[PDB]
Amino acid sequence: EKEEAEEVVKEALKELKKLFEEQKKVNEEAAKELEETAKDEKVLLAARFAVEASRIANKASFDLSKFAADAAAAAVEAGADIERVKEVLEKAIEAQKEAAKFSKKVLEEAAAAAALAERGEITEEDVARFVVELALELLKALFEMQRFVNELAAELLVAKDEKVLLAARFAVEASKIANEASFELSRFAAEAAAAAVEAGADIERVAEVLIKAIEAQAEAAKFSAEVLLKAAAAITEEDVARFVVELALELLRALFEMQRFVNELAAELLEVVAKDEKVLLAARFAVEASEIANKASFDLSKFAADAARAAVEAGADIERVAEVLIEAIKAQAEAAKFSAEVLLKAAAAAALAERGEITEKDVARFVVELALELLEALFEMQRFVNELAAALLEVVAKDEEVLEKARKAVEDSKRENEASFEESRKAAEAAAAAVEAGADIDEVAKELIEAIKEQAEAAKESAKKLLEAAAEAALA
């Protein structure tokens, strides 16, 4: 029974291993042939990209297939109908074959556009667009495999306990929301490389940044698999809630690390594009301001999970705590996408300035109004997480004297967050009025960075005093 079920899993992983290394040898020999038809270096630079990126798609294909097998093995160890395990293993084998057929389809596009360009007609920008468009193709393909395999691993996770099943539902929900945000962050890194190619940047810098973004997806893909395999590797009702909080913190931490790595990939792509000094200062200002907003949002998401930690140690049930953590993770995903859209629009305006279509005052005006958009989105998240902390307090604060001190602390943070945005808004419309009067972007950006950091400082101190009140309410 279960021993035979463990025999089907090991043979499934055995087949997945040979499928992965048969496709490895097929693609590795298609790379030598791709080296032959690489007349001129630009074709070889694109051929080596398609080869290196296809080896990532094939390697990430097996890592996601092995995760499905390890998830199926864990199901057998803790009760499993063997026919639903065979069904999941069969679907994972088809996904490996499908991802293998795509890794070769990538090299088909490479060899086609290769000799086509050396024959003529195809310019280097079309080769540069081919590399960028291919980057989009693999990033989307890796996300679909991870979404499909995580769906299979969801069906596997066995609990036989409502509370533990609610925790498995949270792990599946939180990982799916984070994997969607990581895909959109890597997509913005590829959309930034598309604006750099159409602006005149060299494909060599664009190619290596895209490889950084492709590998970032695979590393986050395996991390999400390892945490979900920890979730399967499960008692105490409070240790289940402690797992949910620690899982929510790890995904928020990996999401910010993706926001940080992708933010730095945009700075590299702006350095090659922004050849003008004053436009480079606007690019470097928007890059830093966007990253500051990423830290502040992550600090506001970590405060929510820390407030949820103080709630589970006070005795709040897992169900309400899982809701607040779900709302916090998607709140960080909203900021991650919003901060990426702001930085994407900044790269476009810098490209317009490089082409000469807009002036430097237009770029200075644009990065200032983008700074206010980030200051508003940070303030809207401060009010959102403040509502979540007030919700968690309404469950743990039962003594009317404890509730009164807690509700007062929620109000004080509401006034502190509001007043901090007024300070950041006054400085925003002051820096905008300076741009129109002809003030140098160096001084405007310097004073706006200090305003954004001062709101981030006020947000930290407000969250510190608020988490303090929730902790004392838990002690009583």
Numbering used by the authors: 1 to 157, 160 to 236, 245 to 486
What does the study report here?
Here we describe extendable linear, curved and angled protein building blocks, as well as inter-block interactions, that conform to specified geometric standards; assemblies designed using these blocks inherit their extendability and regular interaction surfaces, enabling them to be expanded or contracted by varying the number of modules, and reinforced with secondary struts. We construct twistless helix repeat (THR) protein blocks from identical straight α-helices (typically 2–4 helices in each unit); the length of the blocks can be varied simply by varying the number of repeat units. Restricting helical geometry to ideal straight helices with zero helical twist in principle considerably limits what types of structure could be built, but this is more than compensated by the great simplification of downstream material design, as illustrated below. Using X-ray crystallography and electron microscopy, we validate nanomaterial designs ranging from simple polygonal and circular oligomers that can be concentrically nested, up to large polyhedral nanocages and unbounded straight ‘train track’ assemblies with reconfigurable sizes and geometries that can be readily blueprinted.
To generate straight, linear THRs, we set Δθ to zero. This results in perfectly straight repeat proteins in which each repeat unit is translated but not rotated relative to the previous unit. We tested 33 linear THRs (with Δh = 0) with helices either about 20 or about 40 residues in height; 23 of 33 tested designs were solubly expressed, and 13 of 19 designs analysed by SEC were primarily monomeric as designed. Structural characterization of the linear building blocks by X-ray crystallography individually and/or cryogenic EM (cryo-EM) in the context of assemblies (see below) revealed that both the detailed internal structures and the overall straight linear geometry were successfully achieved.
